[PDB]
Amino acid sequence: GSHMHESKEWYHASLTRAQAEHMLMRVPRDGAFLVRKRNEPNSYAISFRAEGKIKHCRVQQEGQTVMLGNSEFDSLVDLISYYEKHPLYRKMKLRYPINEE
Amino acid sequence: LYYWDQ
């Protein structure tokens, strides 16, 4: 699908769950987030901070679209742009993209 | 949840 996420600050092509967790803990704000490519094929994770905890959400890359749960988008950038304006977890929007912080 | 669902 679309590759426009490759230059986004929040996107990390090579970042483990553990590395992602240690990055997010340095940022005491709900809505801190990043996206990382998973070892599983055609899969990403959104790692985010909410209620003082780190959570991870799977995103499946399937054909010309990406899927999070039952929500479907044209691309990963469209998905992130959506959840920057609409809450992903309770009332938390994706708010603070983490670029190595 | 290992992965939060949604």
Q: How far apart are CA A49 and CA A29, in angstroms?
A: 7
Q: Within 10 Å of residue A41's Cβ, how many Cβ atoms? A: 8
Asked if A69's CB is within 8 angstroms of B4's CB, the reply is no
Instruction: Name all domains of chain A by residue range, CATH numbers in brackets.
Output: 1-101 (3.30.505.10)
List CB contacts (< 8 A) between A45 and chain B.
3
What span, in angstroms and rounded, lies between the C-alpha atoms of A57 and A55?
Answer: 7
The answer to whether the Cβ–Cβ distance between A89 and B4 falls below 8 Å is yes
Residue A82, H or E segment:
helix A76-83
Q: How was this structure determined?
A: X-ray
Nearest CA in chain A to B2: A56
Residue A52 identity: G
Query: What tokens does A72 get?
Result: 């479907």
**Alpha-carbon gap, residue A48 to A32, rounded angstroms:** 6
Cβ contact, residue pair B4, A55, below 8 Å = yes
C-beta atoms surrounding A75 within 10 Å: 17
- Amino acid sitting at position A10: W
